[PDB]
Design a protein around this nucleic acid. Structure first.
Ligand SMILES: O=C(O)Cc1cccc(OCCCN(Cc2cccc(C(F)(F)F)c2Cl)CC(c2ccccc2)c2ccccc2)c1
Ligand SMILES: CC1=C(/C=C/C(C)=C\C=C\C(C)=C\C(=O)O)C(C)(C)CCC1
Ligand SMILES: [Zn+2]
Ligand SMILES: [Zn+2]
Ligand SMILES: [Zn+2]
Ligand SMILES: [Zn+2]
Lengths: 317, 10, 369, 12
DNA sequence: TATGACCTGAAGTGACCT
DNA sequence: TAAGGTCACTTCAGGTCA
């Protein structure tokens, strides 16, 4: 086949004759020239399946160079001295999540001799905590609605997700509420617990576990409302819940929360590379706590001593 | 069973 | 004479709206409107957008695109526009200062060429940036330790009760036989884990009861990880000791409850979408041992501090290897939660076995009781 | 607590 | 306030000289 | 011939401003 002498050996175009040791057009000539001169290493994301022809040759430079080199072109033939040499947003915005957290929790503090509520009594810690929980379930759904894309989900799936995550949601909530007090936690009803009371109630183990692994770390890393809301969003969307219509959507939204949170971390706190990873690592500690609390909730409910309200009963039943 | 559905409705 | 341009054009329109495109923008072809909209959407995400009250059936064209911005952006996602194609603020600063202060505009001055009348590049330290030496040393050490501790379980194969194929379906002692078999495999697993954690650096810096508590707590989850690593996608079976394969119904004949068996298979098939290598698995296990939220831990500070290097080392390894997938890292750190849930399920399985007055090996009975 | 401990100090 | 035609402006390509 | 260079030409980022 001596007709191939009149064509380019790479892109299959009409050539000018030999240049780098193979017959190629001015395009591949200038390309190999400009490439080998600086010898810049290309990166092709396909990968490596690219078929180079006359028309599309400029779309992928990597595979074009590889085909040029495969045809027998020499880098030594090239003159001039040289050889070898953010966020993802508005789908799941953190501002709306922040708006949700600010909406649900009015309580904050700024720069003397004031604060909203901290009365106390060590009777009865469990009953008061259940009361506060039942109180905060309504604000939990009201929080859930303000979270992006959740209201767009089917109603039954919303129900399932809330019934699944309500415990860890409330837990993270009162943990971050109690971030300013040690120890221990402030109830949403305003009343105080004081872990001694938890020890005298026999629940001291899980309580001190909450004190150690949640509020302590949150205060140490100084977690704000955005990150709290994002973590609560990760907890909120669980693709692994039972009875889900389309778990892939929930998982996808969760991924969106990952990207958005990591973005907010790479923005607000450029100082700490391990901020995002820390926030994520607070989650497995939460799950073990959230489950252990259900075991006590299933207990005190079955015993029939501590009065349980209707909504909390519904969540437990 | 009942409450949560109605709260989620409106 | 032929025009000296590549010139790939001809009005292929727009993948978002369908107006006339000026070319490819952010990994897709679109018009100026969609491009600018996408840019201002990425750079400002906190901007107020109106929720979609007309349903996700919103139709996109050269007009209604101004109505619903959420659907417009969603179809920009449907168009395949990447968020990483938008230059950040720290990325754009170097795309400015080089093109303004000296190079290519207003200034060229050098030693050669000069009409001056009347008007070390390569490396500082031997760098190449991320993924430092010590990290890769630790990773390779963890992998080598994993293999080395894995080879010890290969000689224990005919130390165990044979599998009763062709067994009476209503036989109780057959189920008991399979159960005993799986428990022995679990013993081998536990010893293997102990050896692995023994070869893990920094682990010897803790106390006796610290190491014991950490091991007893993380054992089941590490077993879940190793099992998910030995899971076969196509055949839908799990292969232990590389010569022993078992299906789900084999676990059903073992006497294990459905609520114990199912989520484990869910967990195993969920991790194959991650496509993790031995390095990432080893790092995940290493981090899992060093979780400080475990019960009966006297010095959680030392454990957390020990968990610190493995976390960031996993980060640098993930970002460099697969820059295309940024969700791999958070999806990996999120598997620990599933490990916690499956740990609870496991404990419930243990209690289930206790309910029928079934006996488990002294080691397994030491850990999970 | 005994058997894990005896598995610790040396090779199994 | 958001929008899109329109610009700045580099990095690149190739037909055609040299 | 076969190496170079030139500079009309494309591209796709951000920025402007009515
Ligand atoms: O083959 C090796 O390399 C050694 C190895 C590594 C990892 C696991 C392993 O044995 C697991 C297979 C049998 N296993 C039995 C078991 C383990 C832990 C606790 C219990 C129990 F006492 F709580 F019951 C049992 Cl019965 C069961 C296995 C499994 C997989 C899928 C469905 C059902 C059961 C498993 C259980 C828990 C965690 C991981 C795997 C040998
Ligand atoms: C930790 C704890 C438990 C559960 C707490 C739960 C499930 C919810 C708390 C909600 C609050 C306290 C909300 C708020 O303040 O907004 C139980 C009862 C099992 C045991 C002792 C105390
Ligand atoms: Zn060519
Ligand atoms: Zn290619
Ligand atoms: Zn368009
Ligand atoms: Zn819409």
């Amino acid at each position: 086949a001596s007709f191939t002498k009149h064509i380019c050996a790479i892109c299959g175009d009409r050539s000018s004759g030999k240049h780098y040791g193979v017959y190629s057009c001015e395009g591949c000539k200038g390309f190999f020239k400009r490439t080998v001169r600086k010898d810049l290493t290309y990166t092709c994301r396909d990968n490596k399946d690219c078929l180079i022809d006359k028309r599309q040759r400029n779309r992928c430079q990597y595979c074009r160079y590889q085909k040029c080199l495969a045809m027998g072109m020499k880098r030594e033939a090239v003159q001039e001295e040289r050889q070898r040499g953010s966020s993802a947003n508005e789908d799941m915005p953190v501002e709306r999540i922040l708006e949700a957290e600010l909406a649900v929790e009015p309580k904050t503090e700024t720069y003397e001799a004031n604060m909203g509520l901290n009365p106390s009594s060590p009777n009865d810690p469990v009953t008061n905590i259940c009361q506060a929980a039942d109180k905060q379930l309504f604000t939990l759904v009201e929080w859930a609605k303000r979270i992006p894309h959740f209201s767009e989900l089917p109603l039954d799936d919303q129900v399932i997700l809330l019934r699944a995550g309500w415990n860890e949601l409330l837990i993270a909530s009162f943990s971050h509420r109690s971030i300013a007090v040690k120890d221990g936690i402030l109830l949403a009803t305003g009343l105080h617990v004081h872990r001694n009371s938890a020890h005298s109630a026999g629940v001291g183990a899980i309580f001190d576990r909450v004190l150690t692994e949640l509020v302590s770390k949150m205060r140490d890393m100084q977690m704000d409302k955005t990150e709290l809301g994002c973590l609560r969003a990760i907890v909120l969307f669980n693709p692994d819940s039972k009875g889900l219509s389309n778990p892939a959507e929930v998982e996808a939204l969760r991924e969106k929360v990952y990207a958005s949170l990591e973005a907010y971390c790479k923005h607000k706190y450029p100082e700490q590379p391990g901020r995002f990873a820390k926030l994520l690592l607070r989650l497995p500690a939460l799950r073990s706590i959230g489950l252990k609390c259900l075991e006590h909730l299933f207990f005190f409910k079955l015993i029939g001593d501590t009065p349980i309200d209707t909504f909390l009963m519904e969540m437990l039943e | 069973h009942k409450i949560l559905h109605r709260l989620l409705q409106d | 004479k032929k025009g000296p341009a590549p010139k790939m054009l001809g009005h292929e329109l727009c993948r978002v709206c369908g107006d006339k495109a000026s070319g490819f923008h952010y990994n897709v072809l679109s018009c100026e409107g969609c491009k600018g909209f996408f840019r201002r959407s990425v750079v400002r995400g906190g901007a107020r957008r109106y929720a979609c009250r007309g349903g996700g059936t919103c139709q996109m064209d050269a007009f209604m695109r101004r109505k619903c911005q959420q659907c417009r952006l969603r179809k920009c996602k449907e168009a395949g526009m990447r968020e990483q194609c938008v230059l950040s603020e720290e990325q754009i600063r170097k795309k400015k200062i080089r093109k303004q202060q000296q190079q290519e505009s207003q200034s060229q001055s050098q030693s050669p060429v000069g009409p001056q009348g009347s008007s070390s590049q390569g490396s500082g330290e031997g760098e190449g940036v991320q993924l430092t030496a010590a990290q890769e040393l630790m990773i390779q050490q963890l992998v080598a330790a994993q293999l080395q501790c894995n080879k010890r379980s290969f000689s224990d194969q005919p130390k165990v009760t044979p599998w009763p194929l062709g067994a009476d379906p209503q036989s109780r002692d057959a189920r008991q036989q399979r159960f005993a078999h799986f428990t022995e495999l679990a013993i081998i697993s536990v010893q293997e884990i102990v050896d692995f954690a023994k070869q893990v650096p920094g682990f010897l810096q803790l106390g006796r009861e610290d190491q014991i508590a950490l091991l007893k707590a993380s054992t089941i989850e590490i077993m879940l990880l190793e099992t998910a690593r030995r899971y076969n996608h196509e055949t839908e079976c799990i292969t232990f000791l590389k010569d022993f394969t078992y299906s789900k119904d084999d676990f059903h004949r073992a006497g294990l409850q459905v609520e114990f068996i199912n989520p484990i298979f869910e967990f195993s098939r969920a991790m194959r979408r991650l496509g993790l290598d031995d390095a990432e698995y080893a790092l995940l296990i290493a981090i899992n041992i060093f979780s400080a939220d475990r019960p009966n831990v006297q010095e959680p500070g030392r454990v957390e501090a020990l968990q610190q290097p493995y976390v960031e080392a996993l980060l640098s390894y993930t970002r460099i290897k697969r820059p295309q997938d940024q969700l791999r890292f958070p999806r990996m750190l999120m598997k620990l939660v599933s490990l916690r849930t499956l740990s609870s399920v496991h404990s419930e399985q243990v209690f289930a076995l206790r309910l029928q007055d079934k006996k488990l090996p002294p080691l397994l009975s030491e850990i999970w009781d």
